[model samples]
Target: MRIINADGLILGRLASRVAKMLLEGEEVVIVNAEKAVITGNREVIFSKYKQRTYPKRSDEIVRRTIRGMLPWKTDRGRKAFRRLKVYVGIPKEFQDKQLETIVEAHVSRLSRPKYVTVGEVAKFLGGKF
Candidate 1:
């Protein structure tokens, strides 16, 4: 299993990279989901987040993003996706483990006008912390 730290990583890039790992038969566990960044216009981002009826929580949002990238209809994809795990913050169980990050997905590369966090989007949608 690979442990990943989501802090400062652009959401889509991180998730898609992890999806590849899953398809390769690796187990992925992500921590600090609340800090993951999404790049785009702020208003439209929130609107889409709300529209997605998506679970507003950070971990769920990240998980859903990863799920969307997998070929889930196939048994292979389903099994691969099942090997993933996401956590809103670092859980006690993962405290001692070293977490990985993707350099390409660093939020600094985002050229969009605005960006938002998975956690903040949930709050705007009226979901509690």
Candidate 2:
């Protein structure tokens, strides 16, 4: 089981790591999902997500971001997706746990600029903080 802290990390890189772990039957728990960074132009990205009707909450956005990294239609992919957990904030149960993070996904790695946090997009989509 891996408990990952999503703060200040690239959504794709973190999702890729989580996908790999799930493929290996390692359950992955993601916390502070709203803090995850999606590197891109804010208006273009936010407008795109606003147009997407698939998700509303930051947690769901994070999940969808990860889902894009996997072949969710297949049995293995769907199973892995099921095991993926994302929370907008640190929950009571997981608060005591030492949260793991991926350095490769760190927002600093973005050579390209113009990024936004999942939470920022959530608000635009009418999601509660």
Candidate 3:
């Protein structure tokens, strides 16, 4: 079991890495999901997500992005996807746990710092929290 901290990590890179681990049969738990960053023109990105009517929550947004990378139609994909867990914040159960961060996906690697967080996107899309 691995608990990954999504804080300041690029969303796409994190999802891709987590998807590979799921296929390898590791149960992955992603916490602080709201802190995950998405690189792009901030306004354009917000418009794109706003056009979509589903998944107003940050956690759901992260999970659905990961689902797009998985072969979710197959049995293997189904099992792998089921093994993934995402949380908006650090829950009490994992408060004392050692959290992992993917340095390869860190926001510092981006050419520009103009990025929006999943949490902000969720709020813009009308998510209550």
Candidate 4:
């Protein structure tokens, strides 16, 4: 099992990295999902997320992005999805776990600072937590 901290990371990059890990039979757990960065304009990003349905919480939004990178319709993709877990914040069960980060997916890699965190996008879409 791999424990990852999603804080300050680019959303798409993080998802792609995790998708490969899942296909390789690794179980991944992501924490601080609300802090994950999505690089784009504020209103532009908000409007996109606004088209989604209800119960669109921050953690769910992050997981959904990751799901898009997988072949969820297939059996292997289903199994891979099953091995992944995401949380808005660090849960008690993972409090003491050593967390890792996808280096290439870091927010610092962005040349331009225009971006929004997953939490903000969720809130704009009337999502809670």
Compare the candidates by lDDT and give the number of the best one: 3
Best by TM-score: 3
Residue clash pairs of candidate 3? none
Q: Write the per-residue lDDT of candidate 2 for residues 1-114, one digit (tens) a residue.
A: 789999998888888888888888888999999999888888988888877868889998888888888888899899988888889899999999889989888988657657
What is the model-wide C-alpha lDDT for candidate 1?
A: 0.88
Off-target runs (Cα >4 Å) in candidate 2 are: 111-113
lDDT of 4 by residue, 59-87 (tens): 88888888889998999999999999999
Off by over 4 Å in 3: none
Per-model TM-score, in order, reads 0.93, 0.92, 0.97, 0.95
Candidate 4 Cα outliers beyond 4 Å, as residue runs? none
Regions of model 1 farther than 4 Å from truth: 110-113
C-alpha lDDT values of all predictions: 0.88, 0.87, 0.94, 0.90
- State, as a TM-score between 0 and 1, how close model 2 is to the true structure: 0.92
Comparing 1 and 2 on TM-score, the stronger one: 1
Question: Can you rank all candidates by TM-score, best first?
Answer: 3, 4, 1, 2
